[PDB]
Structure formats: C-alpha cells, structure tokens
Subunit: 195 residues, 4 copies
C-alpha cells in the first residue's frame, strides 16, 4: 500500500522529467535519490504527526533517533529534554556522492547531523578533512551569522538531519548551557583551519 | 461515511508505524489515542469551518462548549462576547495517562482548560496537587513570559482545550479587564507553591 | 459537475453536524447559508485564480464586480486602477438575518461593502440607521485603530465584500488621495452619532 | 497522463467561467493563456521539487534555464553560484498581447527577465522602447523602493521569469557585487527617460 503511494508519486516525477526533457543520466540520478530517500514507500508524514499530540510525537522521534542520539556525545550525554527539543526540529535529508551540501562563502542558515555517510570538509588550502556518523557540521555560521568557512561535499550517499538557524536559536534559548558545547567545537575548528 | 474516512486515515498511521518498526505496545498506545481523539470519525474540520462565516462558527463553538463554559466560573460569569473570543481560539487536545503535558523549567507558550480528566501538578517539593473538569493551567508562563513553575502530568485520559500565548494576548487586548482574573489566580498559585 | 462538487462538500458538513449533534433549526440555518453562499456549485477558486496571471485575475474581478463598482460612487468615480487594487483584495461573505456582523466596542480589523442586502447600524442611543446596496461600513476602525463605534446587524440575507485593515492600508499607500474619501465619510458619521 | 491532469484542471476553469457567465471572447482568451502557460500538461511541481534536495533542484533549474542564462550577459558572465541563487527564486509567468505587465506610478515589488517575447516600455512622452529575449525590466523600483518609472506592455505572447523584491534583496545580500550591475543599468535607463 505504501509501495503503491510511492509508485504514484514517482510517476509524477517521471512525467515532470519527461516534460522538461532531462537527460538520461540525470533521470537516473533522480531515480536513485528517490529510492534512497523514500525506500519505495510514501505517506503524508506531516498530516500523520499533525494528528498526534506532543508526547506521542516526542516518543516517536526519540525511538527513531536512538542510534543518532547514542552515537553522538553531544546528545548522548545531554539533558534528554534538550535532546527531544532538538530531535523534534530535525529534517531528514539525503545527499548523493559529489553534492556540495555547503559552499564556502555563502550565507549559512542550517546545520547538519550525520546519521550515516562520509563528507569532505574543503577550505582554500588546509588539506581535506572528513566527518562521518556521529558528527555534525554547519554550526559556525549558525553561531556567527557570517559566511560559511568551508565547503562540505558528500563522498558517499549521506543520510543527514538538518537544523535551521531559527530552530537552533529557539532550542538554545530554552537550554542556554548547550550553546557553549557548540561554541567550543566551533572555536576548535576555526583554530584548526586558521581562519 | 465518517467511520470510513477515519479508517483510511488510520491505515496510513499503521503504515507509518510499520515502516518505522515501532514496538507493539507503542502501536497500541497510538491506536488508543486515535480512538479517544477522533472516536472513529474524521472530517476536514478546517475546510468546513472555513466555508462558514463568523456568526455560524461562533454559534457552533458556543454550542459545542456549553458544558465547558457553564462548569468554569471564569467563563460562566464573564461577558459572553469574551467567552466567544476565547472559544474560537481553543484547540482540542487529548492526552493519555502519564503524559507530561507541561515540564517544569521549559519556556511555556500555551495554557490548558480541562474539559474532562485529572492532572497532577508537580513541583520540586510541595506535595502533588490535582486539577480536574472546570479548571485550567499553564497561565503563569503566559502572564510572565518566563519558565514553567511546575510539571503537569495526566493521571487519566484528558480532554483539554489549549490556548496559545499569542491568542491569549490578542483576546486580553480586546477584554483587558479579564487579564486580572487570570493574574489573581496566578498570584495565588505562586504563593501556594512559594516559588 | 459543479452541482456534484457542492454535493460532496455539503455531505461532509452534514457529517460534521451529525457528529456534534447540532440541533435541527441550526442544521437548517447552516443548509440555507450554504445554498445562499455557494448556490449549489463549488470549485477550487484559489487554485484556479492562482493558475492565472495578474492581468486575467484583474479582468475577472472587474467583470464580476461591474454592478458593485457602478452602484458605489467611491468606486464609480475613482481611478479604475485604484478600483482594481481594491477589488483584487475583496472577500465575498454572506450573512443571514440577525447576524451581528460587527459588535460595538470590539477591535475592528475589516470593513464591508454591501453588494446586496440591508443592515442596521445600532449605537447605545441614537436611533437605528440603515445601509444598503452601494454603501459600506466598518471603515472607522480601519482609520482610527480603535474600537467599533456601533454594532451592525443584518436585517436581510446580505452579500458583502470584506476588506482587511492590512489590505485597506496597502491600497491606500499606493493611492493616498483615496484615504481622504474614506476619512470624510468617517468624520461625517462620527459627527452624526455624536461619539 | 499529464495530458489527462491538465484536462481535469481545465474543466474546473471552464466551470468557474460558466458559473460567473464570462463572455465568449474572455473564455477564449483564458483558454489560449492556459495552452500557452501549461502546454496541455500539468503536475504538482511544488510537491515534486519539494521532495528533492538543494543540489537536485539546483541542477534542474540550471538545466531548464540554459538558454536564458547564456543569452543574458548579466547571468552568462556572472559567478555561476549567483546565477543558481537567482534561478532558484524565479517564477515562470506568461503574458498575452496588450497586457500591462507594469503600470507607471504603481508601487513595484517584482522584476522580470524575458525568456521569449517583446515588450513595449511606455513613459508619459519619450518614444516607446522595446525589450526582448535576453533583457530584463522592473529593476528600478526594486532598487529605489519608489514608484514605477514606466508602463511595460506585452506586444507578443511573453514567457517571463519574475523575481520578487524580497528575493532580489536576499540574493544581493549574498552577492553584493552584483548589486552594482543592476544599479548601472537602472541609472542609464533613468538618464535616457530623463526622469
Ligand atoms: O577543521 C574542521 N574540522 C571539521 N569541520 C570543520 C572544520 N572547519 C570547518 N568545519 C565545518 O565546516 C562547516 C562549513 O560551514 P560553517 O562555516 O557554517 O561550519 C563549518 C564546520 O562545521
Ligand atoms: O499551587 C498550584 N495549584 C494549581 N496549579 C498550579 C499551582 N502551581 C502551579 N500551578 C499550575 O502549573 C502550571 C505550570 O505551568 P505554568 O507555570 O505556566 O502555570 C502553572 C499553573 O497553572
Ligand atoms: O451614522 C452612521 N451612519 C452610517 N454608518 C455608521 C454611522 N455611524 C457608524 N457607522 C458605521 O458603523 C460602523 C461600526 O464599525 P466602525 O466603527 O469600524 O465603522 C462604523 C461605520 O461604518
Ligand atoms: O529607457 C529605458 N529602456 C529600457 N527599459 C526601461 C527604460 N526606462 C525604464 N525602463 C524599464 O521600465 C521599468 C518600469 O518599472 P521600473 O521603474 O521598476 O523599472 C523600469 C525599467 O526596467
């Protein structure tokens, strides 16, 4: 039944690609994205969660994110109520190899937690660094309100969870002691890239 | 026919739970919630009320809330036009036993009127107090813009009506004399919990 | 086909009324409203007009409102481009006999143009006055940002077009010379009701 | 299948026109618009692009707009990342011969890039000028926050891409060096029309 709803949606994407005469390799790339992102199933997730209440939604995001939470010290060792407030504002995103998730110099308005995948952190000239499952990136712009200090490129398929600057700020107003945890990491990174 | 629309919606929830591999007890808890919240029937309530006008919507909320109004002195003894302005901005919510409706220390942005159910008011150390049909809670944060002064936990299934801080403020701009009614109760409660 | 879409929508309203156990006279009142408001036909008007462009939407509202425009000196004698800017922001509303469209003392945020119907203007004590096809009301609050100076009650079924304070202000920023036309009428009315 | 979705949508437009008793020539004009705008096919484009990610959406708009980009020096010779930020915020619009896309004296909040078509630029008295594929108009109001300095009328069917003032400002905050490119053209035009 879910296999069916994904099928009808994907048919519309196919029609969109056909109308716009997208090339063959591009259509395959979009197909592969859809299979990785939705895994052959689709539901009106916003309508469903909207029909619930706060406690149920909170129990669901905690259950779904058990591995993300336990695998990242920032979350694992934090007040579970801070963790819940973060989890409720995360957006699942999938990226493909070679995607520029972040471009250096742009104005950043979201950060990313890596559930699964490897990314390259690229700066003018300081040797590529890598981040994987359990790490996060894009926090510096959220803290500074300035420009991205590096590009971040997917090496693999990446399952990420994003957090918008407005949501990051709302949570940190509620849990101001957690602001320093991010600030400490941002400062260490700014030092390491010397800029 | 309504029995039918609830059935199709609930099938989607079942599919969501299946995809996310939620445990058996959790799936039952979500089923029980849905039966209590929607009572086997569903309609596009927002579309319906949207097709009406102000007078009809006002007549409907007044009719539906006759018992809530008559059972709560704040409403029963107030200008019926204030009562209508409140009723039009209430959101029906259902909570299950053990749910933390409010957590102490968090930043509150809504209050609750109890149509039916019992809740426990819990503070660091002052002996649990109980609130039931005809009472309300969560007003203090709405008045102070500060942090919740207690946790409130459902003891029973609870049928509540919530009111957002923005809506509470809009109504009280129109009916500023009613602001003191809430302030008096908030002050009495802050005294009783000594903090 | 439109007769069909209205039928399916109205069935949902019937189900809503049944679920909430609304009284017989109330259900009839809602039926009569629906027949007067939609005249047995329904379409997704917002989706349709959304698919068009500015020029087509403007040509449509002008065509539909030819009688409203020609029957009201404020519009008939104005810059047709001001008239178009007003017409595009009007919302069709239907009221039934006895409805309080406006209540004295409330904070007003919309005004009304009467396409067809009769209303009574009611103030503490100054003798009921009547307004009909070609007139408008609710402008004073829009101009003053204060409280309604009278109640306005439908005597008949009324076909009205409303204009929100924000839309009224946006149009009058573009066409500031038209602000005085409304101000002159508001002042004359404030004089007549002496308050 | 897309031919089918356009057919069902157009039937609703036909029903809307019938209900409002629009004249024959007007109904034909709306039919011709729909054929030019949608070319007999329709999909939920917002839902589709919403299911993708940033990189895919960016690859799609770049592919679809290759000719617009290569045919306009402002884009062709710019940082491709600026171009992408512009392209992602463009809205496709179709206008018909004689449409007033912009009226002199009004408060402007969007500019237009011409993919295909010819427009006339009309001012009080300075001889009509023409703009075509590869040019843009409506930038001056975006820069000045004042009133339109000319009317712009479609001579032909026009395929345009619009950009809102808020989006224009957001992009130019990110790419402030591109602000001067528009300012230089605006100044040259203000000189030429002497006002
Ligand atoms: O030395 C580093 N080791 C690991 N990560 C790093 C390092 N330097 C930068 N980053 C990440 O790259 C992001 C680019 O966007 P941002 O400026 O908003 O935040 C940055 C950091 O999260
Ligand atoms: O002594 C009390 N008797 C009954 N209720 C109480 C008492 N103390 C607090 N409360 C309620 O608990 C809420 C917690 O959220 P809040 O801070 O926004 O508002 C509080 C009050 O409504
Ligand atoms: O003497 C009057 N003759 C006709 N109309 C009048 C007179 N007095 C008031 N009104 C209308 O009643 C409205 C009540 O809402 P409002 O205060 O926003 O604007 C008022 C006027 O439009
Ligand atoms: O001399 C001119 N040659 C070509 N175009 C011109 C000239 N003068 C004005 N325009 C365009 O007309 C628009 C009217 O709206 P706008 O004031 O926001 O921006 C204007 C310019 O883009």
């Amino acid at each position: 039944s879910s296999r069916r709803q994904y099928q009808e949606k994907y048919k519309q994407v196919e029609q969109y690609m056909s109308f716009h005469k997208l090339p063959a390799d591009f259509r395959q790339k979009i197909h592969d994205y859809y299979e990785h992102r939705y895994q052959g199933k689709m539901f009106d997730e916003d309508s469903i969660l909207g029909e619930l209440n706060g406690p149920l939604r909170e129990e669901i995001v905690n259950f779904n994110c058990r591995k993300l939470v336990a695998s990242m010290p920032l979350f694992a060792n934090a007040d579970p109520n801070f963790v819940t407030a973060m989890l409720t504002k995360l957006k699942f995103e999938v990226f493909q190899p070679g995607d520029y998730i972040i471009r250096e110099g742009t104005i950043g308005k979201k950060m990313y937690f890596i559930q699964h995948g490897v990314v390259s952190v690229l700066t003018k000239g300081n040797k590529e660094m890598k981040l994987s499952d359990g790490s996060y990136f894009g926090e510096i712009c959220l803290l500074t309100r300035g420009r991205r200090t590096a590009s971040v490129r997917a090496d693999t398929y990446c399952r990420l969870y994003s957090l918008s600057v407005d949501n990051f700020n709302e949570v940190l107003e509620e849990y101001p002691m957690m602001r320093r945890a991010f600030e400490t990491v941002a400062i260490d990174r700014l030092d390491r890239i010397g800029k």
